[PDB]
Every structure is written in C-alpha cells, then in structure tokens.
Homo-oligomer: A and B are copies of this chain.
Amino acid sequence: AMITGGELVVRTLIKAGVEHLFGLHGSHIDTIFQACLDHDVPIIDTRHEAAAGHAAEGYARAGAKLGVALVTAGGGFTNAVTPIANAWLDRTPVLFLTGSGALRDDETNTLQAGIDQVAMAAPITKWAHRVMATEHIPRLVMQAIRAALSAPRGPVLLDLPWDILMNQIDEDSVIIPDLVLSAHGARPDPADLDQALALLRKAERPVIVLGSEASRTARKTALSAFVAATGVPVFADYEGLSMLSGLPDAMRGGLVQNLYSFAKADAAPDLVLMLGARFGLNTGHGSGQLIPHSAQVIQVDPDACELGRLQGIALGIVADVGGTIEALAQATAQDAAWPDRGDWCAKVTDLAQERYASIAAKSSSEHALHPFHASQVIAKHVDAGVTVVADGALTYLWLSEVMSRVKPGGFLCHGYLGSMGVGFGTALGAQVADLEAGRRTILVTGDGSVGYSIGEFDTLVRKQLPLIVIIMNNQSWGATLHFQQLAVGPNRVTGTRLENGSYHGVAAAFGADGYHVDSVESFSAALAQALAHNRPACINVAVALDPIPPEELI
C-alpha cells in the first residue's frame, strides 16, 4: 500500500510503454533501480553517464521511439550534459531522468547537491523542471514525455530530488495517468496543400529533401504512396537518409550533400520541397550551393523559426512532417494523373553515380589502405537489416561518400553539435533497439573519437550486446590535422598526432574480440567474421591519413 516515489516513476514509465532504460547507478536514484528490478525493466548500466545519455538517444533514433536516460545527482547529471545538448540540436526525443540533492537539507553544502541542474539544462531542452512533491510524479513524468515526443522532438529534463524519490505514499491515493497523445501529427491546411501540390505539378526539376522529423514519425509506407504517384526524387540529410531505404530505386537521390555539383550540369533544382530539413550545416547553410537561391522553396517545419531562416522561401507551412507526408499521400491517391518525370530521375541518379565513380577513380590503395576502400567494405554489408552509426570526422565524410547507394535500416551520424565521440553510446543504445527488430548495429568511428567512451567495450560484454565497433585508425585526430596544414601551413601540426595505442588490445581486455587489419581482404574478412558471430567486436582498421574527402574541399 505504501510505495516509494521511485516506484511511481517506474510505474508511469511502464504505462507510457517504455521497456528500456540506460543509466549509471547512484544512491540518489536507487528507488528507481529497485522498482525496475521488481517489474523486470532492464536498465542498461554503462561506464559513463555520457555513454548512457547517448545510448538513450541511439535507442530513440534507431527505434523511432522514446529514449530514457537515468542519471544520479551532481556528476551523474553534469556527465549527461553533452547527450542533452546533442539531443537538443538533433531534435531527438529523450527523457533525461536525473537525481538531485534532497529538498530537505537544501543549501547545506552536501554530497551531490549544490548545482542548479534545471538552470543548466534550461538552454538545451524543450522543458527542464524539478519535482516538488512525490504525488506530482506520475503527472509530471507524463507531462515531460508528451513534451519530448511532440514536434519538434527534443530532450526533456525531469529532476527528481532524493527526498521525493525515497518518500513513501499510499499507492491507492495517487492516480497514474495514461499517455493520451495522438500518434498522428497535425496536417497542413488543404489550401496550402492544394497550393504546394499545384506548385510541384508544374515543375521541370522538383526534389524532396527529408530531415530528422521525417525519421521520428517514420511514416515510411505513406512516403511510398506519395513518391510513387508523383515520381519525384528524394534526398535527405544524414538523419533522414534511412527514410529513403524503402523507396523504389529510381527516385532515391541520396544525401543532399550531392545536390552540390548540380550547378555545372544545368541541374540546379527547379522547386525544392523541404520536409523538416533545416537551413544550416546539413543543407549548405545560406551559401545556397545545395538549395539554389533561384529555386522556389516549400518548407514544412514544426517551428516557424526554421521557416526560410537563411534564404527567402516561397511557401512557409508549419505542421508535423509526419502528418504532412500523410496528407500528401492521401491527396496524391485519387489524383493519379501526374507529369512525365522519367528523365529527371535518371539525371539525379546519374549525377550521384558520377561523383561516386569519380572518387573511386582517384582512390589508390598502394602503400596505404585508402579510407574510401575501407568505406566500400562496410558498404557491401548494408541493407535494411543494418543500422550504421557514424563518428570521427574524416571517418564519416568518407563514409558519407558510399552511404547514398545502399539502403540502411538506420544511419546515425553527427548533428549540428558535432561532438566527436558521441558514436559509441549512440551505437550501444541503437544495438539494444535493433535487437528487438532483429537487426545489427555497426559503429564506424575514428581512432581519436573511440577513446572518448572506450570503456564501453566492457558494457558490450557485460550486457552481451553484439555491436561491431569499427575504428578508422589513421594514427591521429584526422580532420583537425588537415585543418592545421591546409588552413595554417604544412609543418604546423601540433596536438593532433595520436601515434600510440592498440585499440583491439583494449577491447580484448574487456573481453571483446579484437581484430587489427591493414588491408582490404583482411578487413573484409575480419568484418565478415564479426557479423558471423553474435558477440561484441572491435575491428581496428589501419587506414591512410593523407587523402582528402570531397566535403572538406568546400
């Protein structure tokens, strides 16, 4: 009859439909550990709260569902800050449950109390709030969850004082509410939908560009019905990429990064339909080399701030990307008489094919194994059954170069935050999600980036998570080392040389299979063996440093 506040937290999460938590133990949050123990709710405990946070993100991104991070007071929270800020810029839905000092003995210079965690999380969350009463728990947890899931998606900080968590209340007294929130999003007004549809019908070279908000709602089947009736090519930023994985092969434009050299071939797009993709790092900023200044733009985004923020656009809609896609598939259904778009699809296909073949031709692997070739080795293993997690600068923009012509189940790369090393936690969490859906996760990170959360090879072994960490090891902080040469001068490389350490040796110590390879065939075989067993694996890949990825030259 008497239950702890920590019980209420878990019961509300049970009701909300959560089946996994990612975290690190603390006395302050043990009531939640105890309650999860009782209801068989697995907490995937890590070796760093940053890894736990990133794992909640990874789980959310690869699962298209809610992520839950569980951290303790003080350092527990501060260690989760990078995942918080990363989820913020990436529009990913994570509930960050955090402990704090007890309200009784507030301002007593005590263990793990003393820092305004709500004030700290404020600038980088949709909502950050501290619970003031134990009976408020179910309603406030449910409130926090609604905030995170609705467009635009984002992180929420729920601060649960040790006080409030240890408190015992009569269970029959406080009501645990249901998650009452519509799964379908808000659609555009039929007038703007009639307009956007009209504007794209009379169009010589139209393109769709998908963003993160497309993957959250993940309304794939509707995207098919819409793309089939209209026959319009679809591009995406890294986060939208996997949404193209189910499109008929002809209208798969790939990553928006290659809407770039459309300038030399007349191919400057006529009308661009942006669906949750923002103006910034991912779409060539305002520099307009990706989204051409002379194109008419139709932008759909949950936040009006994003509506033509860097370039003057034509039609500015504010609705949910998911509902918007649904509204487009619904209208496009009976309107089944659409213009001839055979030879714009071929152009988009052929221009991306060009840039690809062009780089393959300039890629030599004599004396040193080329990053491009090691990228093609992973690429040959990429279908809907595989999630790919990208980390590590030079690593990921070489990886980006092969990623457009395969159909990944998921693809989790860096957002605007671009925090080197977020990939390990992300991939761990993604592997937990992919286990339910019968899929495999592969992290592709740099030698420098992996050392951020290298202790997570332990967690992979302890929890038996079959993640294959692939390390592009060019003995350095790659992209930065290039900046020191290309931007400063040839012999001005300081603090970027990382010429020490056997990474497979580290993985071997934590009990995970370590491979160090240095050639195409050996790496190809190592990866094949890694996939072949259901066990965590490190593949230390000795790779070339000197070559320059095309993205860097821009």
Q: Which A residues lie at the B interface, using CB under 8 A?
A: 23-27, 30, 33-34, 36-37, 43, 45, 47-48, 50, 73-76, 78-79, 81-82, 85-86, 88-89, 103-116, 119-120, 122-124, 127, 129, 131-133, 136, 139-140, 142-143, 146-147, 149-151, 175, 177-178, 180-182, 184-192, 278-282, 285-286, 303-305, 307-310, 312-320, 323, 326, 330, 416-422, 448, 451-452, 454-455, 457-458, 461-462, 477, 479-480, 483-484, 487-488, 492, 494-503, 505-506, 508-511
Contacts and interface: CB of A to CB of B under 8 A. Distances in A.
B487 A419 contact: no
A530 B157 CA distance: 45
A48 B82 CA distance: 12
Given A27-B479, A501-B461, A505-B509, A89 B115 contact: yes
A105 to B, nearest CB: 7
Contacts of A103: 132-133
A313 B317 CA distance: 29
Contacts of A508: 505, 509
A133 B104 contact: yes
Contact of A78 (B82, B107, B139): B82
A282 B108 CA distance: 11
A217 to B, nearest CB: 11
Contacts of A281: 109-111
Q: Which of A182, A498, A505 gathers most chain B CB within 10 Å?
A: A182
B492 A37 contact: yes
Across the A-B interface, the 4 shortest Cβ-Cβ residue pairs: A109-B280, A75-B419, A505-B509, A451-B455
B30 A484 contact: yes
A487 B109 contact: no
B495 A501 contact: no
A516 to B, nearest CB: 11
Contact of A27 (B37, B146, B487): B487
A381 to B, nearest CB: 26
Given A79-B419, A462-B497, A501-B458, A187 B186 contact: yes
Contacts of A181: 304, 307, 316, 318
Nearest to A318: B150
Q: Which secondary structure characterizes the binding site on chain A?
A: loop
B33 A457 contact: no
A458 B143 contact: no
Contacts of A30: 480, 483-484, 487-488
Contact of A312 (B26, B73, B175, B457): B175
A182 B497 contact: no
Contact of A178 (B312, B488, B495): B312
Contacts of A191: 184
Given A127-B305, A189-B184, A452 B285 contact: no
Contacts of A143: 107, 305, 309
A139 B79 CA distance: 32
23 contacts: A27-B480, A37-B492, A43-B494, A47-B448, A48-B421, A74-B85, A74-B416, A74-B419, A75-B86, A75-B419, A79-B421, A81-B82, A106-B131, A106-B133, A111-B418, A146-B316, A149-B304, A150-B304, A180-B307, A180-B308, A184-B189, A189-B326, A461-B501
A422 B122 CA distance: 25
Contacts of A50: 79
Nearest to A23: B495
Contacts of A511: 500-502
A317 B182 contact: yes
Contacts of A27: 479-480, 483, 487
